[PDB]
Design a protein around this ligand. Structure first.
Ligand SMILES: COc1ccc2c(C(=O)Nc3ccc(NC(=O)c4nn(C)c5ccccc45)cc3C)cnn2c1
Ligand code: NI
Length: 274
């Protein structure tokens, strides 16, 4: 079929009557996530924006990773509904978030080879985001989605940014998850692909521990103080030393000394094929 839209609606608009919401999967501050059906036969995930939590323009900006980047390693945007309640429709990921999947009976049983494969799959998606001049800014296991075939995809919830001059600076009152955030981003609000690399090293600890919180037994101030002295996270239990040394490259003090996502992908592939 290669041989064969109103301006006031989004270019990605679908009529709401093409969707049937079936099961509530979760609820947050910005809204609820549902499993639904598009035109009866296609399973979809629908995010309904909570009326008042944030502006329509920010939730539906064309800036904007999902509208701009498509890749097998990235959760695919399907459509939007721009009349209230605002819907964001995406491909359905049967096994949900990686952090939840790792705690299920099948996730607990994952061999180290499968955990490294999944880590290589995230680095592959991040190598695409890097090459496209984007930063993710919230790279943690909670934002990785898992398919029915146990493949991983990166999801964006509005923090990803197109970088023009290699860096984005966050606002004065911005609050980020401290345990995943690189020192230069905590201190100066400066986010680059290199602060995503730092975050990936933290995400690797969530993968190897089957969803445990990074820096066990430590508060956010104790984490910042430790980092300032040159300490890094204590070797997690059941963490292969080779993986720990790859995590440490991600945690180099100078952002420019941290590896690229392509390098990380290449090493992780070698780790699970060896
Ligand atoms: C089985 O359990 C589960 C649980 C969850 C899911 C999802 C899922 O979560 N998909 C998904 C991913 C990202 C978004 N994006 C946003 O919510 C969004 N918010 N802002 C502010 C944005 C700004 C710009 C762009 C996007 C956004 C929406 C959905 C719907 C897919 N399968 N699946 C299965
Ligand atoms: Ni054709």
């Amino acid at each position: 079929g290669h041989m064969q839209k109103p301006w006031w609606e989004d270019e990605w608009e679908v009529p709401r009557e093409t969707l049937k919401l079936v099961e509530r999967l979760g609820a947050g501050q910005f809204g609820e996530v549902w499993m639904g059906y598009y035109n009866g036969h296609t399973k979809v995930a629908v995010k309904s924006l909570k009326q008042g939590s944030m502006s329509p323009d920010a939730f539906l900006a064309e800036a904007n990773l999902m509208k701009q980047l498509q890749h097998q390693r990235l959760v695919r945007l399907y459509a939007v509904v721009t009349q209230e309640p605002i819907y964001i429709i995406t491909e359905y990921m049967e096994n949900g978030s990686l952090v939840d999947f790792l705690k299920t009976p099948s996730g607990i049983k994952l061999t180290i080879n499968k955990l490294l494969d999944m880590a290589a799959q995230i680095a592959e998606g991040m190598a695409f985001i890097e090459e496209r001049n984007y930063i993710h800014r919230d790279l943690r296991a909670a934002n990785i989605l898992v398919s029915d075939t146990l493949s991983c995809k990166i999801a964006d919830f509005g923090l990803a940014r197109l970088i023009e001059d290699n860096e984005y600076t966050a606002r004065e009152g911005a609050k980020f998850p401290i345990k995943w955030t690189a020192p230069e981003a905590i201190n100066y609000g400066t986010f680059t692909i290199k602060s995503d690399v730092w975050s990936f090293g933290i995400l690797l600890t969530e993968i190897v521990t089957h969803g445990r919180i990074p820096y066990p037994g430590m508060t956010n101030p104790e984490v910042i103080q430790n980092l300032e002295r040159g300490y890094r996270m204590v070797r997690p239990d059941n963490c292969p030393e080779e993986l720990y040394q790859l995590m440490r490259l991600c945690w180099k003090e100078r952002p420019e000394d941290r590896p690229t996502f392509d390098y990380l992908r290449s090493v992780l592939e070698d780790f699970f094929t060896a």
